[PDB]
Ligand binder design. Structure first.
Ligand SMILES: [Cl-]
Length: 217
């Protein structure tokens, strides 16, 4: 049992038949960074409601450089009201405002941020945990990072491997792909990058786990 074996098994189930190319809706856009932050300690279905409030108030529109500045400079109580559905709305409003302001300060633009950001820079933004930092790196910045989470932990535990530490759980998932890189890329007929492969692999694990729960299994 390595992660390349798990990737092949999950691939064979066609779990992402109705999903977009990078699994996360609106991947590689500022909206993906916002959802990666808002999903912490909650369910993605609640995040979609917060994102809808942001679009309905015209805080989030079509130009991502403008979107970044709107969050950096928004009135706190206005943002907190919009993000109520995804919970912890005072902490999450402040975390978004501060993160957005620091992206402008250190990188000047969302475009440059996607090129130059590091995981440690994101972890130095107060309140951003490892799952959220890695989801930004993969699904917003197209970096070769695989996100892990409680679902991945429980999924591997059921198969008989318990890795409670986030970075070691991540390294287990990454290294099996790295050690078998030619084979892993051939699953997609060499049409996708390793970053997109990790985007989809984490998506498979989540889709498998959500169904296990709704179907009771
Ligand atoms: Cl939180």
């Amino acid at each position: 049992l390595d992660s390349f074996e798990i990737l092949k098994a999950l691939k064979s189930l066609d779990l992402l038949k109705n999903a977009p190319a990078w699994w996360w809706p609106n991947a590689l856009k500022f909206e993906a960074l916002l959802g990666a932050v808002l999903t912490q300690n909650t369910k993605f279905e609640a995040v979609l409601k917060s994102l809808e409030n942001l679009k309905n108030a015209f805080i989030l529109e079509n130009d991502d450089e403008i979107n970044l500045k709107k969050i950096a400079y928004i009135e706190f109580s206005k943002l907190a009201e919009c993000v109520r559905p995804s919970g912890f709305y005072n902490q999450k409003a402040k975390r978004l405002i501060d993160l957005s302001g620091n992206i402008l300060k250190d990188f000047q633009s969302f475009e440059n941020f996607k090129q130059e950001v590091t995981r440690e820079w994101l972890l130095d933004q107060k309140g951003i945990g490892k799952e959220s930092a890695d989801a930004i790196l993969c699904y917003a910045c197209a970096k070769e990072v695989m996100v892990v989470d409680k679902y991945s932990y429980l999924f591997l535990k059921k198969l008989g491997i318990e890795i409670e530490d986030y970075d070691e759980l991540q390294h287990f998932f990454e290294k099996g792909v790295q050690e078998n890189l030619n084979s892993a890329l051939a699953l997609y007929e060499n049409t996708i990058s390793l970053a997109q492969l990790y985007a989809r692999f984490h998506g498979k694990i989540v889709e498998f786990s959500k169904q296990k729960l709704e179907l009771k299994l």
